[PDB]
Design a binder for this molecule. Structure first.
Ligand SMILES: CC(C)n1nc(C#Cc2cccc3cc(-c4cccc(C(F)(F)F)c4)ncc23)c2c(N)ncnc21
Length: 249
């Protein structure tokens, strides 16, 4: 139904790469194309599921899914985002954000994640790398991909993936936004895994910036609760951020 006939898509410069590679493309304007290539049965399965999940999504902070192509090769085309991911801006570009932009980023990410969970969709790998800033003001959530242990919840470390795992990952992003640096900065990787997995280790909330609102730190701590059931739902935290963002205005 959303299939793009062959010949319409023009594939351009290569961006990323084993299962598939993504290119910048032109289809009624700037678009991104993720192409396949032997296609593994799991790879074909993931291709089917990604199209199935993406078509059910129509939200501004969720990466716009424009279509899929089959004739030349299996491919999925999405909107082209100009800018860099949240991970690059915070930890690689060494660019300090105004607090209003930070809460706006957390507010925007909260909207998309709440939209996903409202659609019974779980974003199993949520992290600063998977948050893209279109232009520099609008955030787009997508699967721009072991490498993401820091965002993994205690239960997923021990053994699983659920809404509670997603909201915990949202907490680390809150820690990244407010502190400006990766969690567990003091620590090595095996030491972090065992300590966090056993519950001995938790991010250092004192490192947060002074301008951080009191409600945000409390909200951040609530998301990082070791008990899965203790973590708040995305409707609650979206309302809290938006209410706080409204007050700041
Ligand atoms: C960083 C740089 C190399 N890169 N990679 C871009 C891309 C892309 C995608 C292409 C085709 C299908 C996709 C599906 C998903 C996906 C899958 C499952 C769940 C979710 C969700 F749950 F998280 F939503 C999202 N994510 C991304 C793409 C990209 C871009 N589109 N624009 C600028 N730079 C870009």
């Amino acid at each position: 139904d959303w299939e793009i006939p062959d010949g319409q898509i023009t594939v351009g410069q290569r961006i990323g790469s084993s299962f598939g590679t993504v290119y910048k493309g032109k289809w009624h304007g700037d678009v991104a194309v993720k192409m396949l290539n032997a296609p593994t049965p799991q790879q074909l399965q993931a291709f089917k599921n990604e199209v199935g999940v993406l078509r059910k999504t129509r939200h501004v902070n969720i990466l716009l899914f424009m279509g899929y192509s089959t004739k030349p090769q299996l491919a999925i085309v999405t909107q082209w985002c100009e800018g860099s991911s949240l991970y690059h801006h915070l930890h690689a570009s060494e660019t300090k954000f105004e607090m209003k932009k930070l809460i706006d980023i957390a507010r925007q990410t909260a909207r998309g994640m709440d939209y996903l969970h409202a659609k019974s969709i779980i974003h199993r790998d949520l992290k600063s790398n998977n948050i893209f800033l279109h232009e520099d003001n609008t955030v787009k959530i997508g699967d721009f991909g072991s490498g993401s242990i820091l965002w993994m919840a205690p239960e997923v470390i021990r053994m699983p993936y659920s809404f509670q795992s997603d909201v915990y990952a949202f907490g680390i992003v809150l820690y990244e936004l407010m502190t400006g640096q990766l969690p567990y900065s003091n620590i090595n990787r095996d030491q972090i895994i065992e300590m966090v997995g056993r519950g001995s280790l938790s991010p250092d909330l004192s490192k947060v910036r002074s301008n951080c609102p009191k409600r945000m730190k409390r909200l951040m701590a609530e998301c990082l609760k070791k008990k899965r059931d203790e973590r708040p739902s995305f409707p609650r935290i979206l309302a809290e951020i938006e209410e706080l963002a409204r007050e700041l205005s």
